[PDB]
């Protein structure tokens, strides 16, 4: 179950016991970070000249002289061997020896090891994570846990650049970090050194940069300050800006100046990376030369980032050849998944897939932009680690499961059950979607076809939907009480509650389908109406972010099935008993075309596309109104007019006037009312 899978592996079907007495060779000349891991696995057991020999070292150390032809000639490569007589842990360099110990740890199970020989190295030079999303940046504790996660999975790159960090971007990118933040970054560097991770500190100055010597010197003095805190890798981001910062000639000259007077003057600087203004094909200029200007001017040692054909996209062979021909070097991939800062009411916990597995030679690096929930991003981050190290053997679904069993061994099935139905994005401006609920979709669709048109449904499909809802409630309850990874549970709790209510509503709707007598039907109908109101309450109190507030879950297949079945059986009931039950699926306290009202924060809106009127559930102080292509009231009858101001964009302030009724009548497609709460 080795992850990432080695490049060469030979297994024997013999097993040996971890030596109760051993003899260590090279503990004083091999990588201290590797030796530490090794003595943790050996602790309690006896060290002496007598007993089984264990040899650790880098190529060149006396300890591994006998094995120098077995060691691959690759950066961060290594050689591992286990048999009845000895154990050999030999890297090509110090990082190779560490990675050798990471594979060693997985092999050890029940104090036993397999007789095995491994020769291994990475297909992609730089592999890791870039924290470059919009929203609440990762807490200090989350980042400490991230960096240890990367070393176990042989990730060698952590790029720091949260967009909402003011000392990284606007407005204070010229200012050194305050003492509290500086000591915290100094600890992150230490921890990342211990885990063999390059800490890349980025800076995002392009929105108000001036191409003079004052800003150029200040950017360097900040880089020097970051250097004093330990940083040895650096990046400059020019994404999502307007104005003079988009000049490719000035951008290249700045990065070349950083190379020659900073990166070439220090003794120990590693990566130097920049992100271009045009960072995807769809947004580049055909009548232009931005990318060819960078490609010709940028020093060859400086990397250039790229998200692919679009802002959210999969990386193909056509797409990477399109950019490599222009920038005149292999691209440094910035892959925007599972980042969710444009769909903040969803969790994206599905598998990693869609990236070509034969283009390892065509890319300098590969980093994933994750979500603001750090522990939840581990599922996809684990998969990127596997993909980037050995793409030729990358198995999508098997790594998704292996990730889940590593993140939460105590309740892995319960978490897989949760993630299976929390992976799609819903409709979004990028048109980027993922698979969800694929195992139950066939039976779901067959049940609803037959149900809508009087035919009998297969009893097996009906039982498959009952089995689903029942297991959903098991996982929700078990996950909420799980203390193995308390940070993970805290992140997902609002979705876990909504998950459970979805499942309860599902069971009640299926009982409406069975529908024995009239009295039972109305009982289940009233219970569904209560569950709807409960889902509304969570949606309005939990995760009230300023962008897409609320909580959505199981949206691709499960929620449409429950809503469509509820609407259908309610209409059959009204036809049979001549009744007038409400068939609407989402609770809404306000009232009144078929466009439903929405409540987002303190806003009340109509969904975008004598006359008509909106009635609130009470009186509220009014703030403003916005319409895009006349009167208000508090009791219905006594109205009053306020006029609008145009600039498509009609606005008007209410200035705290009491309001309950709003009307538009016949005078000269968003439509929003903002109130005070
Ligand atoms: C290079 C890159 O991806 N930049 C940002 C990025 N921005 O892409 C945009 O949506 N760009 C944009 C679109 C409209 C207005 C302003 C910027 O995409 C990622 C996914 O949202 C964000 O996390 C990144 O910070
Ligand atoms: C919820 C507020 C919001 O949408 N913030 C946000 N801003 C930007 O761009 C700011 C220039 C953004 C870009 C890409 C993805 C998400 C984003 N969110
Ligand atoms: Ca050495």
Short mmCIF file of C-alpha atoms in Angstrom, two decimals, residues 43-361:
data_model
loop_
_atom_site.label_atom_id
_atom_site.label_comp_id
_atom_site.label_asym_id
_atom_site.label_seq_id
_atom_site.Cartn_x
_atom_site.Cartn_y
_atom_site.Cartn_z
CA UNK A 43 13.37 2.57 20.21
CA UNK A 44 13.36 0.07 23.07
CA UNK A 45 15.41 -2.41 21.05
CA UNK A 46 19.07 -3.02 21.85
CA UNK A 47 22.04 -1.42 20.08
CA UNK A 48 25.45 -3.11 20.09
CA UNK A 49 28.16 -4.50 17.85
CA UNK A 50 26.42 -7.88 18.12
CA UNK A 51 23.40 -8.54 15.93
CA UNK A 52 21.82 -7.55 12.63
CA UNK A 53 23.51 -4.75 10.71
CA UNK A 54 21.63 -1.63 9.60
CA UNK A 55 23.41 0.71 7.18
CA UNK A 56 22.23 4.27 6.56
CA UNK A 57 24.03 6.96 4.61
CA UNK A 58 24.37 9.18 1.58
CA UNK A 59 26.44 8.34 -1.49
CA UNK A 60 30.01 9.09 -0.39
CA UNK A 61 29.69 8.08 3.26
CA UNK A 62 31.80 5.11 4.37
CA UNK A 63 28.63 3.42 5.64
CA UNK A 64 27.19 2.73 2.17
CA UNK A 65 30.43 2.27 0.16
CA UNK A 66 29.43 -1.32 -0.65
CA UNK A 67 26.12 -0.19 -2.22
CA UNK A 68 27.10 2.79 -4.38
CA UNK A 69 26.11 1.06 -7.63
CA UNK A 70 22.60 0.32 -6.34
CA UNK A 71 21.90 3.99 -5.52
CA UNK A 72 20.02 5.76 -8.35
CA UNK A 73 21.72 8.74 -9.95
CA UNK A 74 18.82 11.12 -9.40
CA UNK A 75 18.24 14.07 -7.09
CA UNK A 76 16.33 12.85 -4.01
CA UNK A 77 16.73 9.23 -5.13
CA UNK A 78 17.50 6.37 -2.77
CA UNK A 79 18.06 2.64 -2.39
CA UNK A 80 16.26 0.46 0.14
CA UNK A 81 16.94 -3.21 0.80
CA UNK A 82 15.63 -5.63 3.43
CA UNK A 83 16.49 -9.32 3.75
CA UNK A 84 17.32 -11.91 6.41
CA UNK A 85 20.89 -10.65 6.86
CA UNK A 86 20.85 -6.83 6.73
CA UNK A 87 18.97 -3.58 6.05
CA UNK A 88 20.29 -0.85 3.73
CA UNK A 89 18.94 2.73 3.65
CA UNK A 90 20.96 4.76 1.14
CA UNK A 91 19.99 8.02 -0.55
CA UNK A 92 21.70 9.77 -3.44
CA UNK A 93 21.71 12.89 -1.24
CA UNK A 94 20.52 13.85 2.24
CA UNK A 95 16.93 14.28 1.10
CA UNK A 96 17.06 10.87 -0.58
CA UNK A 97 17.98 9.25 2.73
CA UNK A 98 15.03 10.92 4.50
CA UNK A 99 12.54 9.79 1.84
CA UNK A 100 14.06 6.31 2.16
CA UNK A 101 13.02 6.36 5.81
CA UNK A 102 9.48 7.48 4.88
CA UNK A 103 8.99 4.36 2.75
CA UNK A 104 10.64 2.23 5.47
CA UNK A 105 8.01 3.37 8.00
CA UNK A 106 5.09 2.23 5.84
CA UNK A 107 6.72 -1.19 5.35
CA UNK A 108 6.89 -1.83 9.12
CA UNK A 109 3.71 -3.62 10.27
CA UNK A 110 3.32 -5.59 13.52
CA UNK A 111 7.06 -5.36 14.17
CA UNK A 112 7.63 -7.26 10.92
CA UNK A 113 9.07 -6.32 7.53
CA UNK A 114 8.95 -7.82 4.03
CA UNK A 115 12.06 -9.04 2.26
CA UNK A 116 12.19 -6.40 -0.45
CA UNK A 117 14.46 -4.26 -2.63
CA UNK A 118 13.50 -0.75 -3.79
CA UNK A 119 15.11 1.78 -6.15
CA UNK A 120 13.18 5.05 -6.18
CA UNK A 121 13.22 8.73 -7.17
CA UNK A 122 10.70 11.43 -8.17
CA UNK A 123 9.47 12.00 -11.72
CA UNK A 124 8.67 15.69 -11.05
CA UNK A 125 11.35 17.96 -9.57
CA UNK A 126 9.16 20.15 -7.31
CA UNK A 127 5.95 18.78 -5.74
CA UNK A 128 3.82 20.37 -3.01
CA UNK A 129 1.23 22.92 -1.87
CA UNK A 130 0.62 26.63 -2.52
CA UNK A 131 -1.60 28.42 0.00
CA UNK A 132 -2.72 31.16 -2.37
CA UNK A 133 -6.49 31.24 -2.06
CA UNK A 134 -8.87 34.04 -1.04
CA UNK A 135 -10.46 33.86 2.39
CA UNK A 136 -9.51 33.08 5.97
CA UNK A 137 -5.82 32.06 5.94
CA UNK A 138 -4.71 28.83 7.56
CA UNK A 139 -4.18 29.03 11.31
CA UNK A 140 -0.68 28.60 12.71
CA UNK A 141 -1.54 25.18 14.14
CA UNK A 142 -2.94 23.97 10.82
CA UNK A 143 0.27 24.89 8.99
CA UNK A 144 2.43 23.05 11.54
CA UNK A 145 0.36 19.92 10.82
CA UNK A 146 0.50 20.49 7.05
CA UNK A 147 4.31 20.58 7.01
CA UNK A 148 4.65 17.23 8.78
CA UNK A 149 2.08 15.76 6.37
CA UNK A 150 4.21 16.84 3.39
CA UNK A 151 7.40 15.14 4.59
CA UNK A 152 5.65 11.79 5.07
CA UNK A 153 4.40 11.96 1.47
CA UNK A 154 7.68 13.32 0.01
CA UNK A 155 6.34 16.77 -0.80
CA UNK A 156 9.27 19.18 -1.01
CA UNK A 157 7.59 22.56 -1.59
CA UNK A 158 5.29 24.82 0.47
CA UNK A 159 4.55 28.18 -1.18
CA UNK A 160 3.20 30.79 1.25
CA UNK A 161 0.90 33.44 -0.19
CA UNK A 162 -2.58 33.89 1.31
CA UNK A 163 -4.30 36.69 -0.59
CA UNK A 164 -5.82 38.21 2.55
CA UNK A 165 -2.47 38.55 4.36
CA UNK A 166 -1.74 42.31 4.31
CA UNK A 167 2.04 41.90 4.75
CA UNK A 168 2.06 39.57 1.70
CA UNK A 169 -0.14 41.71 -0.57
CA UNK A 170 -1.93 45.06 -0.46
CA UNK A 171 -1.44 47.31 1.34
CA UNK A 172 1.53 46.60 3.64
CA UNK A 173 3.75 44.34 1.50
CA UNK A 174 6.57 46.87 2.07
CA UNK A 175 6.48 46.35 5.85
CA UNK A 176 8.27 43.66 7.87
CA UNK A 177 6.00 41.32 9.78
CA UNK A 178 5.19 42.32 13.39
CA UNK A 179 7.05 40.49 16.14
CA UNK A 180 4.23 38.01 16.82
CA UNK A 181 3.87 37.04 13.16
CA UNK A 182 7.65 36.97 12.58
CA UNK A 183 8.37 34.51 15.39
CA UNK A 184 5.55 32.31 14.03
CA UNK A 185 7.02 32.29 10.51
CA UNK A 186 10.44 31.55 12.03
CA UNK A 187 8.96 28.42 13.65
CA UNK A 188 7.36 27.31 10.37
CA UNK A 189 10.76 27.52 8.64
CA UNK A 190 12.39 25.39 11.35
CA UNK A 191 9.64 22.76 11.16
CA UNK A 192 9.77 22.69 7.36
CA UNK A 193 13.55 22.19 7.48
CA UNK A 194 13.03 19.18 9.76
CA UNK A 195 10.59 17.71 7.21
CA UNK A 196 12.77 18.40 4.14
CA UNK A 197 10.28 20.97 2.78
CA UNK A 198 11.37 24.15 0.98
CA UNK A 199 9.53 27.13 2.50
CA UNK A 200 8.85 29.48 -0.42
CA UNK A 201 7.65 32.90 0.75
CA UNK A 202 5.79 34.78 -1.98
CA UNK A 203 4.93 38.48 -2.29
CA UNK A 204 2.07 40.11 -4.24
CA UNK A 205 3.00 43.76 -4.88
CA UNK A 206 1.69 44.47 -8.39
CA UNK A 207 -1.43 46.50 -7.60
CA UNK A 208 0.45 49.65 -6.52
CA UNK A 209 4.07 48.96 -7.49
CA UNK A 210 6.09 51.75 -9.11
CA UNK A 211 8.97 50.98 -11.48
CA UNK A 212 11.44 53.20 -9.65
CA UNK A 213 14.31 52.50 -7.28
CA UNK A 214 12.34 53.20 -4.07
CA UNK A 215 9.93 50.27 -4.46
CA UNK A 216 12.62 48.00 -5.92
CA UNK A 217 14.85 48.61 -2.89
CA UNK A 218 11.93 48.10 -0.49
CA UNK A 219 10.96 44.77 -2.06
CA UNK A 220 14.58 43.64 -1.61
CA UNK A 221 14.75 44.86 2.01
CA UNK A 222 11.63 42.79 2.76
CA UNK A 223 13.21 39.75 1.09
CA UNK A 224 16.24 40.38 3.32
CA UNK A 225 14.01 40.52 6.41
CA UNK A 226 12.39 37.23 5.40
CA UNK A 227 15.91 35.86 4.87
CA UNK A 228 16.86 36.73 8.46
CA UNK A 229 13.89 34.63 9.65
CA UNK A 230 15.25 31.54 7.83
CA UNK A 231 13.60 31.77 4.40
CA UNK A 232 15.74 30.41 1.54
CA UNK A 233 13.18 30.26 -1.31
CA UNK A 234 11.24 33.19 -2.73
CA UNK A 235 8.44 34.06 -5.15
CA UNK A 236 6.86 37.15 -6.74
CA UNK A 237 3.17 36.98 -7.74
CA UNK A 238 1.63 39.21 -10.44
CA UNK A 239 -1.81 37.58 -10.66
CA UNK A 240 -5.14 39.47 -10.57
CA UNK A 241 -3.89 43.05 -10.90
CA UNK A 242 -4.38 46.04 -13.18
CA UNK A 243 -2.17 48.96 -14.14
CA UNK A 244 1.59 49.34 -14.55
CA UNK A 245 2.32 46.08 -12.71
CA UNK A 246 1.26 44.12 -15.81
CA UNK A 247 4.29 45.24 -17.86
CA UNK A 248 6.17 42.07 -18.88
CA UNK A 249 9.41 43.96 -19.54
CA UNK A 250 9.46 45.50 -16.05
CA UNK A 251 8.37 42.24 -14.42
CA UNK A 252 11.23 40.31 -16.00
CA UNK A 253 13.79 43.00 -15.15
CA UNK A 254 12.70 42.90 -11.50
CA UNK A 255 13.07 39.12 -11.26
CA UNK A 256 16.45 39.24 -13.02
CA UNK A 257 17.57 41.94 -10.58
CA UNK A 258 16.49 39.75 -7.65
CA UNK A 259 18.46 36.88 -9.17
CA UNK A 260 21.70 38.79 -9.69
CA UNK A 261 21.90 40.93 -6.54
CA UNK A 262 20.18 38.63 -4.02
CA UNK A 263 19.83 35.03 -5.18
CA UNK A 264 23.37 34.99 -6.63
CA UNK A 265 24.92 36.83 -3.66
CA UNK A 266 23.65 34.46 -0.95
CA UNK A 267 25.23 31.04 -0.37
CA UNK A 268 22.11 28.89 0.10
CA UNK A 269 19.10 30.05 -1.96
CA UNK A 270 17.03 27.36 -3.71
CA UNK A 271 13.84 28.16 -5.66
CA UNK A 272 13.06 31.50 -7.31
CA UNK A 273 9.55 31.55 -8.80
CA UNK A 274 7.17 34.06 -10.36
CA UNK A 275 3.47 33.94 -11.29
CA UNK A 276 2.57 35.83 -14.49
CA UNK A 277 -0.33 38.21 -15.00
CA UNK A 278 -1.62 36.04 -17.87
CA UNK A 279 -1.53 32.65 -16.13
CA UNK A 280 -3.96 30.66 -18.31
CA UNK A 281 -4.54 30.28 -22.04
CA UNK A 282 -8.15 31.50 -22.14
CA UNK A 283 -7.18 34.85 -20.56
CA UNK A 284 -4.00 35.57 -22.54
CA UNK A 285 -4.01 38.13 -25.34
CA UNK A 286 -3.83 36.82 -28.93
CA UNK A 287 -2.90 40.28 -30.29
CA UNK A 288 -0.04 40.45 -27.79
CA UNK A 289 3.35 39.19 -26.64
CA UNK A 290 3.27 39.08 -22.82
CA UNK A 291 4.29 35.42 -22.57
CA UNK A 292 6.97 35.56 -25.28
CA UNK A 293 8.44 38.68 -23.66
CA UNK A 294 8.83 36.87 -20.33
CA UNK A 295 10.17 33.78 -22.09
CA UNK A 296 12.94 35.72 -23.83
CA UNK A 297 13.88 38.06 -20.96
CA UNK A 298 13.56 35.94 -17.81
CA UNK A 299 16.79 34.31 -16.65
CA UNK A 300 16.71 30.56 -17.41
CA UNK A 301 16.89 29.54 -13.73
CA UNK A 302 13.65 31.39 -12.83
CA UNK A 303 10.40 29.41 -12.89
CA UNK A 304 7.10 30.56 -14.40
CA UNK A 305 3.72 29.44 -13.08
CA UNK A 306 0.63 28.38 -15.03
CA UNK A 307 -2.85 27.03 -14.19
CA UNK A 308 -3.52 25.45 -17.61
CA UNK A 309 -6.05 26.21 -20.32
CA UNK A 310 -8.34 28.04 -17.85
CA UNK A 311 -8.29 29.30 -14.27
CA UNK A 312 -9.77 25.95 -13.22
CA UNK A 313 -8.59 23.26 -15.61
CA UNK A 314 -6.97 19.87 -16.03
CA UNK A 315 -3.41 19.68 -17.35
CA UNK A 316 -3.12 17.99 -20.77
CA UNK A 317 -0.31 17.34 -23.23
CA UNK A 318 -1.69 19.90 -25.70
CA UNK A 319 -2.02 22.55 -23.00
CA UNK A 320 1.49 22.25 -21.59
CA UNK A 321 3.09 22.20 -25.04
CA UNK A 322 1.20 25.41 -25.82
CA UNK A 323 2.78 27.29 -22.90
CA UNK A 324 6.23 25.66 -22.97
CA UNK A 325 6.79 26.80 -26.56
CA UNK A 326 6.18 30.42 -25.54
CA UNK A 327 7.92 30.69 -22.14
CA UNK A 328 10.85 28.60 -23.49
CA UNK A 329 11.03 26.34 -20.42
CA UNK A 330 8.94 23.67 -18.65
CA UNK A 331 5.96 25.16 -16.84
CA UNK A 332 5.55 25.23 -13.04
CA UNK A 333 1.95 24.04 -12.66
CA UNK A 334 -0.41 25.81 -10.22
CA UNK A 335 -3.45 23.50 -10.10
CA UNK A 336 -6.63 25.11 -8.73
CA UNK A 337 -8.15 22.14 -6.88
CA UNK A 338 -9.53 21.54 -4.33
CA UNK A 339 -9.63 25.34 -3.75
CA UNK A 340 -13.20 26.52 -3.12
CA UNK A 341 -12.93 30.28 -2.53
CA UNK A 342 -15.55 30.83 -5.27
CA UNK A 343 -17.97 28.15 -3.97
CA UNK A 344 -17.52 28.67 -0.23
CA UNK A 345 -20.73 26.83 0.73
CA UNK A 346 -19.40 23.52 -0.68
CA UNK A 347 -16.82 21.02 0.52
CA UNK A 348 -14.71 19.46 -2.26
CA UNK A 349 -13.56 16.12 -0.82
CA UNK A 350 -13.58 13.99 -3.99
CA UNK A 351 -10.69 12.27 -5.74
CA UNK A 352 -7.94 13.90 -7.79
CA UNK A 353 -8.23 13.11 -11.50
CA UNK A 354 -8.08 14.54 -15.01
CA UNK A 355 -4.34 15.28 -15.32
CA UNK A 356 -2.31 13.54 -18.03
CA UNK A 357 0.01 10.92 -16.55
CA UNK A 358 2.74 10.95 -19.24
CA UNK A 359 4.03 14.55 -19.14
CA UNK A 360 6.35 14.47 -16.12
CA UNK A 361 9.24 15.62 -18.33
#
